[PDB]
Each structure stands twice: as C-alpha cells, then as structure tokens.
Design an enzyme around this catalytic site. Structure first.
Site, PDB file in Angstrom:
ATOM      1  N   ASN B  10       0.717  -1.530  -0.058  1.00 34.26           N
ATOM      2  CA  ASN B  10      -0.213   0.173   0.019  1.00 34.26           C
ATOM      3  C   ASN B  10       0.793   1.392  -0.355  1.00 34.26           C
ATOM      4  O   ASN B  10       2.425   1.443   1.276  1.00 34.26           O
ATOM      5  CB  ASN B  10      -0.650  -0.058   1.348  1.00 34.26           C
ATOM      6  N   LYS B  12       1.331   5.092   0.992  1.00 35.12           N
ATOM      7  CA  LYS B  12       0.706   5.701   1.864  1.00 35.12           C
ATOM      8  C   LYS B  12       1.508   7.463   1.418  1.00 35.12           C
ATOM      9  O   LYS B  12       2.398   7.408   1.194  1.00 35.12           O
ATOM     10  CB  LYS B  12       1.216   5.427   3.269  1.00 35.12           C
ATOM     11  N   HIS B  86      -9.309  -0.067   4.346  1.00 32.42           N
ATOM     12  CA  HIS B  86      -8.203   0.215   4.964  1.00 32.42           C
ATOM     13  C   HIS B  86      -8.349   1.029   6.706  1.00 32.42           C
ATOM     14  O   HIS B  86      -9.518   1.709   6.727  1.00 32.42           O
ATOM     15  CB  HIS B  86      -7.202   0.620   4.801  1.00 32.42           C
ATOM     16  N   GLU B  88      -7.695   3.806   8.009  1.00 29.14           N
ATOM     17  CA  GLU B  88      -7.546   5.254   8.215  1.00 29.14           C
ATOM     18  C   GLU B  88      -9.585   5.358   7.229  1.00 29.14           C
ATOM     19  O   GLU B  88      -9.758   6.590   7.431  1.00 29.14           O
ATOM     20  CB  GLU B  88      -7.020   5.994   7.754  1.00 29.14           C
ATOM     21  N   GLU B 158      -6.581  -6.813  10.060  1.00 28.26           N
ATOM     22  CA  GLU B 158      -5.603  -5.228  10.035  1.00 28.26           C
ATOM     23  C   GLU B 158      -5.824  -5.554  11.723  1.00 28.26           C
ATOM     24  O   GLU B 158      -6.939  -4.745  11.886  1.00 28.26           O
ATOM     25  CB  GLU B 158      -6.263  -4.132   9.643  1.00 28.26           C
ATOM     26  N   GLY B 164       0.464   1.939  16.689  1.00 29.55           N
ATOM     27  CA  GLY B 164       0.550   2.699  17.738  1.00 29.55           C
ATOM     28  C   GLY B 164       0.086   3.172  18.872  1.00 29.55           C
ATOM     29  O   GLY B 164      -0.282   4.010  19.370  1.00 29.55           O
ATOM     30  N   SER B 204       1.791  -5.295  11.199  1.00 27.83           N
ATOM     31  CA  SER B 204       3.404  -5.023  11.221  1.00 27.83           C
ATOM     32  C   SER B 204       3.921  -6.323  11.207  1.00 27.83           C
ATOM     33  O   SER B 204       4.763  -6.722  11.537  1.00 27.83           O
ATOM     34  CB  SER B 204       3.910  -4.246  13.058  1.00 27.83           C
TER      35      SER B 204
END
Lengths: 234, 238
Positions: B10, B12, B86, B88, B158, B164, B204
């Site tokens: 992906n 970004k 996704h 976001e 995901e 984060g 990750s």
C-alpha cells in the site's frame, strides 16, 4: 538494513533501585544499552551495574586529564552537547566539537547531541541550525573517527513548550542528518551511523518511533520505563 | 495445500521513499515462486505506476474508489485490483461497514479483484469485542455478495489495536484472528469458498517475522506499506 540500535538513559526515582531493575531484566536481542551518570554517581553505577549488555557513560567531561582518568577507571563512553549544555551552560558548537575530538582521541565512544529550539524551528531554521551543529563536529574528525561516534537528535523545540513531535517529524529530522553525513562524509559512514532520538519517548510511542527508517535508538532520561524503551528496539 | 499467496503493498502519501526508485527495485527483483504481487497506488500516482511497473508477477491496484463510473474508467484503463476499508478510511474518513460493503459490491460488479480490509481497535480488543467487531465487519460485506462473487474477494485482517499503541501482535494472535475469519466464512458461506479464500495479514511485518507469520495455517500473504523491505516480504511467501 539498520546498524545495531543503542538505548541510552541520561540521569538528570532512586539510582540504585533502577540499577537493580536493569540488572534483572532479560534483553535477548542485539542492542547496546548505555547508562550515563554524573560524576557524583559514577562510582556507584560501575559498582552496581552488572548487566552484560549495558555500559557506563560519563557526561560533558572536556579536560584531557579527566578523560584519561575515566578510561583508566573503566569508562569508555561519554555523552556531550546535550541541550542544557548549549542553552544554560553556554557550551557552543566549537566547545562541543573540541570535547568530542578530545573524547575520540582518547578511545571513547561518543554520543554527541544536537538539536534546535522553538525559536529556531519557527523561523524555519532547523536545517541550518542542525547542520551547523554537526559541520562543526565533523570539521574536527577524521573519516575513521566516525566509527566511534553516535548522534542524538534533541527536538529542544519540543521539551517544555507544549509542542509535540510526531514520528514523522523525528523521521524528517533524522533524514537530513543522514543525507548530510552521506554527501559530505560518505555513504559508507552514513550507512553505519546510529542516529538516536532524544525527545519525549514512552511505552506508547517507542515502537512507532523506532520503526522509522532513520531512527536507530534512543537517548532519554533514566526512568523505570527505560525498560520498555529497550524492548522497543526490535 | 494453501491457495496462491498474495503480497500487496500500500502506498501512503508522505513516505520517506520515492515511488519511482521503489518501482525500479521491484522491476529488477527476481521472484521464482507462484505469488501475485500487488502495488496499490493513489490516483495521482496511478498513471506513473502502469507506465513504469513491468515485472510479470506484479499488478497494480486502485484505492478506495466507490463510484461506478470511476470503477469502469479504472478497468478500461487497465486496473483490475482495488483495496478498500483500510483502517484510516474507517477512522478518519468515516467509512462505515455498510459504506465499505457497498464499495466492495460495486467493485465486484465491475470485474475487480478486491482486497477488503477488516480489523478491531485496542479499545474493542481490550473489552473482549474482537469477534463481534470482526464478524460484523465481514457480515456486512457478505450481505452484499453472491456465493460466486467470493472468487473475486480477498480479506486482509488489520490488527488496528497494534499500530500506534505499543502493543505487539504475535504470530499466534494473527493465526487466531485469521481462523475466526475462516470459520465464519466456512459456516456461513461454504467450506468450498472458505478453503479457497486468501486472508492477508495487514499488521506490522518485516523480514525477521514474515516467515513465522506466513507459516501459520490460515495466513495467505500480506497487505503492508510500500517500502524497500517489501521485497523480503515477498520472499517470505514460500
């Protein structure tokens, strides 16, 4: 592909109690751990700290006889140019530079700090301030000396101001340090350079920070959370 | 036998890497096993990606388009993949389960292969709501599809709770999340559809852990961010 990470703690909690914490912590990955202490606490740190992956640093020593004494005593690392040396004590670029060169000449591994202020950053002078802190340092060194050198970037603009740094901003400041060393010194030296982040780092953010391309570890204050900072170095 | 693995990258905006330099790296990488490699790009970069990317084992995807005329424009143009839902899109842009479900249907209707993203947050995880959150996100999607449609669908799990937050996902947790997705498709859609389904890990992932993740029974590849390490991620698919 990243060089060996460094996890360095700066003592500005009880020292002993923290040293016991670390002495009993299992670290299973390749990371150099550093505990930098003041002259009053040095002897108790080398006495007590017995973790194999940890070494002890001195701070700000700038006199050749003292540097020689420290090495005799079993101290091979030293941290210089931290933010407060520049802005309270008046250590300039050149004074830090001489301290670094003298440290290097006596067989010390060196964590040299650099970083900008909120005033500097708000006028858009990050790059000129930050690249001048290093040019000065680089001007004193031979190409081989870089083997003995680590950079910590300190986002001074972000400590005690109410301004917060994002990993993106850490990454961007780290890349410019890299670029410069890479163009002026070399891509070989650049590639092997450990650039440490000396900003605000805790357990919620250490991973994210460490995962950026150009961040190679941390220079932070000595607290119990340091242990999560080490862990983040995978 | 696991089904064909997918290695999806992906893009970004605001990355430290250069798109072109990354496309060159890939163009010159030898990949000797059966693996569909996807490079998912934003609309501004699309045109540069079709013109530049020429590796036989790579295709290009679009992201988040949801307008019928647009999806037809993409297919005429030579884009057959798309990535949706996704993290976001769900947290910043306000794309709910239903909006994602409609995007998937319309993508499917126009002949796209579809990578639909799903996953829970730390909050949802810590209250023990993984299953209901995760199964509701997919149930939404399923409700729009026909059994045959599944041939065009890939799921990326995901672990939002792990990006984060200081939380770290083990291959065991990835396996457990992936098996629930599999169980549910199986029971609700079919054992045939289940067994042929690719369920990608979108957490990750690096070179030290792609292997260990790829060997888990229900892991069929990766949806990750476009970086140079993507190369090692591909290699971890044997």
């Amino acid at each position: 592909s990243k060089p060996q990470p460094i996890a360095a703690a700066n003592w500005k909690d009880s020292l002993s109690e923290l040293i016991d914490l670390f002495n009993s912590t299992s670290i299973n990955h390749d990371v150099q751990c550093v505990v930098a202490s003041t002259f009053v606490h040095l002897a108790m740190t080398k006495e007590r700290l017995s973790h194999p992956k940890f070494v002890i640093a001195a701070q700000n020593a700038g006199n050749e006889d003292s540097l020689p004494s420290l090495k005799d005593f079993g101290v091979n690392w030293i941290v210089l140019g931290h933010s407060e040396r520049r802005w309270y004590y008046g250590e300039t670029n050149e004074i830090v530079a001489d301290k670094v060169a003298a440290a290097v000449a006596s067989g010390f591994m060196v964590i040299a700090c650099i970083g900008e202020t909120l005033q500097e950053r708000e006028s858009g002078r990050t790059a000129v301030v930050v690249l001048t802190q290093i040019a000065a340092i680089a001007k004193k060194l031979k190409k081989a000396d870089w083997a003995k050198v680590v950079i910590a970037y300190e986002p001074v603009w972000a400590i005690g101001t109410g301004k917060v740094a994002t990993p993106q901003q850490a990454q961007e400041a780290h890349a410019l340090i890299r670029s410069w060393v890479s163009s002026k010194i070399g891509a070989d030296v650049a590639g092997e350079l450990r650039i440490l982040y000396g900003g605000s780092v805790n357990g919620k953010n250490a991973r994210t920070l460490y995962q950026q391309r150009d961040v190679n570890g941390f220079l932070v204050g000595l607290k119990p959370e340091f242990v999560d900072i080490i862990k983040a170095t995978q």
